[PDB]
Amino acid sequence: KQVEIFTDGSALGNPGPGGYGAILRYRGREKTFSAGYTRTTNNRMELMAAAVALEALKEHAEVILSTDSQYVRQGITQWIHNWKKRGWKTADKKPVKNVDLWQRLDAALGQHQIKWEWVKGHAGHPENERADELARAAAMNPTLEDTGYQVE
């Protein structure tokens, strides 16, 4: 009755072609999601992976989401609630970097019960390693445009 989610994102530049990988497991079966983008960043792909995986759930679910992304971890544990208080802007009044994706992720997280597993390394986390392989394979064959990517 719980959904296990494992995500990763990767890009070949800063900005360059990138992609994500997401694996969803529920009631012993798995589903895989992966897509590649022409010009993006590692952080956007790491964040997009989690949003996409949470979007495939079409009803409230109890979720264990495992990701080794430091970026996603800081957003969830330190940044998002402060950014909402400040209307999604930094102190210089610019929109937060990647606000499009943070808002997409935030929408999805507010419908579920999520236990976040912040993993550190591929050893002993085979699904996270597989999600990394998926993301890298998608970066090698991009088909989509990452419309919200902006320089700097």
From Swiss-Prot:
Upon changing residue 132 to H/N, the result is: Slight decrease of activity
Cited function? Endonuclease that specifically degrades the RNA of RNA-DNA hybrids. RNase H participates in DNA replication; it helps to specify the origin of genomic replication by suppressing initiation at origins other than the oriC locus; along with the 5'-3' exonuclease of pol1, it removes RNA primers from the Okazaki fragments of lagging strand synthesis; and it defines the origin of replication for ColE1-type plasmids by specific cleavage of an RNA preprimer. Involved in production of retron derived msDNA (a branched RNA linked by a 2',5'-phosphodiester bond to a single-stranded DNA).
Disruption outcome? In a strain that encodes a retron, the msDNA is abnormally sized.
| Cofactor descriptive note | Binds 1 Mg(2+) ion per subunit in the absence of substrate. Requires millimolar levels of Mg(2+) for maximal activity. Has low activity at micromolar concentrations of Mn(2+) and is inhibited at higher Mn(2+) levels. Can bind a second metal ion at a regulatory site, or after substrate binding.
Where is Mg(2+) 1 annotated to bind? 8, 46, 68
Enumerate the subcellular locations listed in this protein's record, separating them with semicolons.
Cytoplasm
Q: Where does Mg(2+) 2 bind?
A: 8, 132
In its UniProt entry, the species of origin is given as Escherichia coli (strain K12)
Q: What is this protein called?
A: Ribonuclease HI
Q: What cofactor does its activity depend on?
A: Mg(2+)
What is stated as this protein's family in its record?
A: Belongs to the RNase H family.
List the keywords (alphabetical).
Cytoplasm, Endonuclease, Hydrolase, Magnesium, Metal-binding, Nuclease
Its assembly, as annotated, is: Monomer.
Q: Is DNA damage a UniProt keyword of this protein?
A: no
Write out the GO MF terms: endonuclease activity; magnesium ion binding; nucleic acid binding; RNA-DNA hybrid ribonuclease activity
Enzymatic reactions: Endonucleolytic cleavage to 5'-phosphomonoester
Q: What is its EC number?
A: 3.1.26.4
Please tell me, according to the UniProt entry, what happens when changing residue 122 to A. Reduces activity
Which superkingdom heads the taxonomic lineage of this protein's source? Answer: Bacteria
Q: Which GO terms describe its biological process?
A: DNA replication, removal of RNA primer
One matching Pfam family is RNase_H
Please give an example of a GO cellular component term from this record: cytoplasm
According to the entry, every stretch annotated as the RNase H type-1 domain falls at 1-140
Q: Which InterPro entries match?
A: RNase_H, RNaseH-like_sf, RNaseH_domain, RNaseH_sf, RNaseHI
